[PDB]
Design an enzyme around this catalytic site. Structure first.
Site, PDB file in Angstrom:
ATOM      1  N   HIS A 164      14.390  38.512 -50.579  1.00  0.00           N
ATOM      2  CA  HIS A 164      13.734  39.504 -49.582  1.00  0.00           C
ATOM      3  C   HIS A 164      13.714  39.821 -47.963  1.00  0.00           C
ATOM      4  O   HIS A 164      13.528  38.414 -48.183  1.00  0.00           O
ATOM      5  CB  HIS A 164      12.448  40.342 -50.230  1.00  0.00           C
ATOM      6  CG  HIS A 164      12.663  41.057 -51.952  1.00  0.00           C
ATOM      7  ND1 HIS A 164      13.338  41.627 -52.382  1.00  0.00           N
ATOM      8  CD2 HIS A 164      12.863  39.966 -52.850  1.00  0.00           C
ATOM      9  CE1 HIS A 164      13.978  41.796 -53.812  1.00  0.00           C
ATOM     10  NE2 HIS A 164      12.561  40.378 -54.319  1.00  0.00           N
ATOM     11  N   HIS A 202      18.845  41.636 -50.365  1.00  0.00           N
ATOM     12  CA  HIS A 202      19.645  42.127 -50.934  1.00  0.00           C
ATOM     13  C   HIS A 202      20.306  44.130 -49.751  1.00  0.00           C
ATOM     14  O   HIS A 202      19.117  43.362 -49.164  1.00  0.00           O
ATOM     15  CB  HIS A 202      19.543  43.273 -51.732  1.00  0.00           C
ATOM     16  CG  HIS A 202      17.861  42.962 -52.080  1.00  0.00           C
ATOM     17  ND1 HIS A 202      17.561  44.693 -51.297  1.00  0.00           N
ATOM     18  CD2 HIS A 202      16.276  42.673 -51.968  1.00  0.00           C
ATOM     19  CE1 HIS A 202      15.917  44.353 -51.141  1.00  0.00           C
ATOM     20  NE2 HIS A 202      15.529  43.603 -51.767  1.00  0.00           N
ATOM     21  N   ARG A 223      16.356  44.828 -58.185  1.00  0.00           N
ATOM     22  CA  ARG A 223      17.576  44.359 -56.671  1.00  0.00           C
ATOM     23  C   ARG A 223      18.368  43.334 -56.958  1.00  0.00           C
ATOM     24  O   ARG A 223      19.157  42.948 -55.844  1.00  0.00           O
ATOM     25  CB  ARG A 223      16.831  45.711 -55.887  1.00  0.00           C
ATOM     26  CG  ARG A 223      15.562  44.922 -55.008  1.00  0.00           C
ATOM     27  CD  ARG A 223      15.051  45.786 -54.407  1.00  0.00           C
ATOM     28  NE  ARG A 223      14.629  45.304 -53.426  1.00  0.00           N
ATOM     29  CZ  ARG A 223      12.533  45.794 -53.914  1.00  0.00           C
ATOM     30  NH1 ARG A 223      12.239  45.940 -55.365  1.00  0.00           N
ATOM     31  NH2 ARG A 223      12.000  45.442 -52.811  1.00  0.00           N
ATOM     32  N   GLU A 240       8.891  40.199 -53.256  1.00  0.00           N
ATOM     33  CA  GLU A 240       8.720  40.995 -51.323  1.00  0.00           C
ATOM     34  C   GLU A 240       7.144  40.665 -51.275  1.00  0.00           C
ATOM     35  O   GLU A 240       6.903  40.472 -51.639  1.00  0.00           O
ATOM     36  CB  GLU A 240       9.875  41.591 -51.609  1.00  0.00           C
ATOM     37  CG  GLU A 240       9.581  42.715 -49.613  1.00  0.00           C
ATOM     38  CD  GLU A 240       9.982  41.928 -48.645  1.00  0.00           C
ATOM     39  OE1 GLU A 240       9.874  40.412 -48.365  1.00  0.00           O
ATOM     40  OE2 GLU A 240      10.885  42.024 -47.935  1.00  0.00           O
TER      41      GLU A 240
END
Lengths: 255, 253
Positions: free
Chosen positions: B187, B10, B61, B88
């Site tokens: 991520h 992202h 996100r 992540e």
């Protein structure tokens, strides 16, 4: 045991102010419609709702509505499932036409039947129709549990319930019986079809049921997945009845 | 190749400008990060991508990134599945710390090791850590495939692969073999982990892989789901290299 669920119809879109039947046309929400979604999310947050699953139609306005609500709740991770079986009722050839114009042309009585009756079927949409291609050439309808050529070209409210009921019984109702907190982001008539079933509303009485846009609809069901009482609207009751009258008046001639 | 897959990390968040390790902190995308997502969507639309399934982590996100991409593609109806296994890499106690300040205090090479090492595990995050509560008191971690108390408190890139591989094997890989076009919205490091596996990157070479934010990564796989060639960043290579250098430079004084 008792179970509660939330269903609602998305907010306004461009054709709302224009007073045109939208139905299967994949129109996006406008600024106001997005705000309506955020408002619903804020109300649900206030009630501390913690959803487990979200069901929507494949019309992007119902999906975007769900996404906005989930963001307001900080629950974007909650599973979402979208199906054409929750799509708004197919208005056939009436798609894109002005409701008031139809009232002037065919009379208020006929328009009320087209809009709210249970058994009246709108004229089928033809390939020559301005919005036909935009609808049936979309890939989302090529991967449904029903072949593209077998999808409806128009639907009576009864037709809607017949293709929606199986989805409710088979994929949503089980989750309700498992005590899961469900949100159904749907449309005006597909929601009316579901309510008619859950509340046991007669063919005649369903004609008088009109749902306001962007308003959480609370429903309590019993062990037999039947409405314990009538559906309730969350929010200022006066503004809600005013919004309902507004929708009713779209099918009337100026006075 | 027999199959094609798209994965990406992202765009920007508030801590990008602040240059602070975000990791499991559920920070939202900022204006720029949202735009980065729209650009990915536009780039994928320009290449005719038609997704059948999208996988994301449970950090919002990555979910919002997927939603913004699908909107640009007019594919909001495409099924989405989310899992903590795509989250992540957990920076443990380093979460919230400023990368450049850490490089100043301990040396650029030391920070580069902590950031890109395959084996080094960051110190576990303690309950006294400023962001411990905001992380583990969330309902999303009470409904994972492992108990809340079993979730990691810190992870080396190797640890990440160990908990991500099961998800790839069980949920994602099967769909790819079925011919479905998949989008993986993940991520920086969780993506590095998957790439290491798919491309058979050695423990040594993975250290040199840094991924730019908001850039579609095309991976072409064979019948055994092994990369046929190195990953391909979709876009202007010059701008992509500058974006990579941008990430690397966060650890320089």
């Amino acid at each position: 045991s008792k179970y509660k669920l939330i269903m609602l119809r998305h907010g306004e879109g461009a054709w709302n102010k224009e007073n045109r039947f939208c139905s299967w046309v994949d129109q996006k929400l406008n600024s106001e419609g997005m705000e309506e979604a955020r408002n619903c999310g804020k109300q649900l947050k206030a009630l501390n709702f913690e959803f487990d699953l979200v069901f929507t139609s494949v019309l992007n306005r119902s999906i975007h509505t769900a996404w906005l609500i989930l963001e307001e709740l900080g629950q974007e991770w909650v599973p979402v499932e979208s199906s054409w079986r929750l799509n708004e009722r197919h208005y056939g050839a009436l798609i894109g036409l002005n409701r008031e114009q139809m009232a002037l042309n065919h009379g208020e009585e006929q328009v009320r039947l087209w809009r709210r009756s249970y058994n009246v079927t709108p004229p089928p949409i033809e390939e020559s129709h301005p919005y036909y291609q935009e609808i049936y050439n979309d890939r989302r309808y090529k991967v449904c549990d029903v072949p593209l050529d077998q999808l409806p070209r128009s639907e009576s409210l009864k037709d809607v319930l017949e293709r929606l009921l199986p989805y409710w019984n088979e994929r949503i109702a089980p989750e309700v019986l498992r005590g899961k907190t469900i949100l159904i982001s749907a449309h005006g008539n597909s929601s009316r079809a579901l309510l008619k079933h859950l509340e046991g509303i007669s063919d005649e009485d369903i004609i008088n049921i009109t749902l306001p846009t962007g308003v959480p609809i609370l429903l309590e069901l019993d062990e037999n997945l039947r409405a314990v009482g009538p559906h309730q609207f969350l929010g200022d009751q006066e503004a809600i009845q005013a919004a309902i009258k507004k929708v009713e008046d779209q099918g009337k001639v100026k006075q």
